Design a protein around this ligand. Structure first.
Ligand SMILES: CC(=O)N[C@@H]1[C@@H](O)[C@H](O[C@@H]2O[C@H](CO)[C@@H](O)[C@H](O)[C@H]2NC(C)=O)[C@@H](CO)O[C@H]1O
Length: 540
């Protein structure tokens, strides 16, 4: 007669192709990429003949076979594709095969193939839009926003984006390489710990707890291998396979290492580490280069060289070549983008007419034009045009776009930036004709999280009532609020100024809109970005 029906033993059923060491702070030890997951199953036979061959089936297909030598057995085998499998043990002899009931096993991989889709309802004022304009709708999500700001990946209005950028991936390096980090308490030391045993100029993860280990919605079970931002982003990819999720390398305080990549030895090491990063973290769709900035004038006053423009073009070309090779190895399309200064002086340090041939999108940082770092020259921080009281204003969105177009950049490459926050001053005084910008300030406005910067959510929630004046400058296309008693003045984007940017993008056939940072919106800004670009309301 055929063998008795085996009973699968109680045991671990969760396995991982990319393993995460739960007691490691160094990135080199934190993650172990394998070619396949090591899977184990055991069984008992409580009634009958144990057969002569035992097999482990996954969805009916044999993954392991061996002699059946007793009433209990154990099988160890490899599974090289992530997902969920109906696993059975079968005992076979000449008279037949008898299969156990199925037990589901989970084989994790960093594409999120093991995860249920993270499809969360829209929050606050966010309304559903379909991505049918063909325009970029992008936003940056910051790794540290999960702490005080409490803004996690499940709160991203993901259906209302084409591009979600993750800020920020650091480049390893200690003294002289990441000195800008020393201005943030504990941050330099955190990077050195992540990069222990890891060569300078390879990428790493700045906050592995936030990125991979903090419990979050959908990834709370202790043996879920990927938690934190990355685990949730994997599940988000399962819900939105057309969403492009890009890691952004650099930003204000992690840009110092770019200034050394004129040395091709370092540049080659960096590019190879980016390829390895994308082979490790499969939910990412490319790379964003947020080098602030070629030529200097970023966080570090001691960095910046006339060579930087050439280094930038070489970097984009070599990144594109690496991504093209990754693309044909995987069958996937990979994107290369960059966040760049919107000032004409800065733009003309780089030959974007050449670099554009390597790049899918240029994220034009048409914001932070003015702020509390200068208390004497006040202006709109993210306006489309110059205001009427100073038509020669240098730093406007249009002047940045025009600088790119004058180089020969194709307009469809250019993604215009919107601000989900205000910048502002306190004690504004000595202004003429009821225009506070013509005065001077005594300090920064009190911020939501940092001096001089206010979340748009708080502008809308607190500074659009009481004594606060509200004015929409229709020449510049820029709103501002002013508290006369204290001289508090805040410049920001609102639904109308975003609408002007979106219409301007359509009229000039630019690439779309993007924002920083997604956590600071209440929905008004992203709603207007979508509507003004012609995205249809509703869900597709
Ligand atoms: C061009 C641009 O994006 N804006 C610059 C600001 O980033 C910069 O302020 C700095 O902003 C960073 C985040 O973007 C912060 O991490 C950093 O603490 C902050 N540093 C400051 C306020 O000194 C300012 C600095 O003058 O320049 C803008 O142009």
């Amino acid at each position: 007669a055929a063998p008795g029906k085996p009973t699968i033993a109680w045991g671990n059923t969760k396995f991982a192709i990319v393993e995460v060491d739960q007691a490691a702070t160094a990135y080199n030890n934190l993650v172990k990429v394998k070619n396949a997951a090591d899977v184990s199953v055991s069984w008992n036979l409580w009634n009958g003949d144990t057969g002569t061959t035992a097999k482990v089936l996954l969805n009916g297909k044999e993954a392991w076979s061996g002699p059946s030598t007793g009433s209990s057995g154990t099988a160890n085998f490899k599974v090289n594709k992530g997902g969920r499998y109906q696993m059975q043990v079968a005992l076979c002899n000449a008279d037949g095969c008898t299969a156990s009931d199925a037990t589901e096993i989970v084989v994790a991989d960093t594409d999120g193939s093991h995860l249920a889709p993270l499809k969360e309802p829209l929050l606050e004022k966010n309304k559903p839009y379909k991505q049918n304009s063909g325009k970029v709708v992008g936003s940056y999500f910051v790794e540290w926003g999960v702490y005080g700001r409490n803004f996690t990946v499940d709160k991203i209005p993901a259906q209302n984006l084409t591009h979600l950028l993750y800020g920020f991936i650091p480049i390893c390096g200690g003294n002289g390489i990441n000195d800008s980090l020393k201005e943030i308490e504990g941050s330099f030391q955190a990077l050195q710990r992540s990069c222990q045993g890891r060569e300078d100029f390879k990428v790493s993860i700045h906050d592995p707890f936030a990125a991979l280990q903090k419990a979050q919605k959908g990834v709370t079970a202790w043996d879920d291998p990927y938690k934190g931002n990355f685990g949730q982003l994997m599940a988000l990819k399962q819900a939105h396979p057309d969403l492009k999720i890009l890691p952004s390398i650099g930003g204000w305080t992690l840009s110092d290492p770019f200034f050394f990549m004129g040395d091709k030895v370092k540049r080659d090491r960096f590019v190879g580490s980016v390829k390895e990063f994308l082979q490790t973290w499969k939910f990412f769709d490319g790379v964003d280069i947020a080098w602030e900035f070629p030529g200097g004038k970023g966080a570090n006053p001691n960095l910046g060289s006339p060579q930087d423009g050439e280094t930038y073009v070489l970097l984009m070309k070599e990144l594109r070549a690496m991504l093209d090779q990754l693309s044909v190895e995987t069958g996937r399309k990979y994107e290369l983008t960059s966040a760049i200064s919107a000032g004409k002086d800065m733009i003309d340090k780089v030959a974007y007419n050449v670099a554009q041939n390597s790049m899918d999108h240029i994220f034009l940082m048409s914001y932070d034009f003015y702020g509390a770092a200068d208390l004497k020259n006040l202006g709109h921080q993210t306006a489309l045009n110059a205001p009427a009281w100073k038509p020669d204003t240098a730093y406007t969105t249009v002047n940045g776009v025009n600088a790119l177009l004058a180089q020969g950049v194709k307009p469809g490459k250019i993604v215009v930036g919107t601000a989900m926050y205000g910048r502002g001053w306190t004690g504004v005084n000595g202004y003429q004709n009821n225009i506070p910008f013509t005065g001077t300030a005594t300090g920064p406005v009190k911020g939501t999280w940092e001096n001089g910067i206010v979340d748009y959510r708080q502008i809308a929630g607190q500074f659009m009532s009481g004594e606060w004046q509200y004015t929409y400058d229709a020449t510049a296309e820029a709103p501002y609020v002013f508290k006369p008693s204290t001289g508090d003045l805040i410049t920001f984007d609102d639904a109308r100024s975003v609408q002007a940017k979106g219409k301007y993008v359509l009229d000039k056939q630019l690439g779309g809109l993007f924002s920083a940072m997604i956590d600071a919106d209440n929905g008004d800004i992203l709603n207007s970005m979508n509507a003004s670009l012609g995205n249809s309301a509703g869900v597709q």
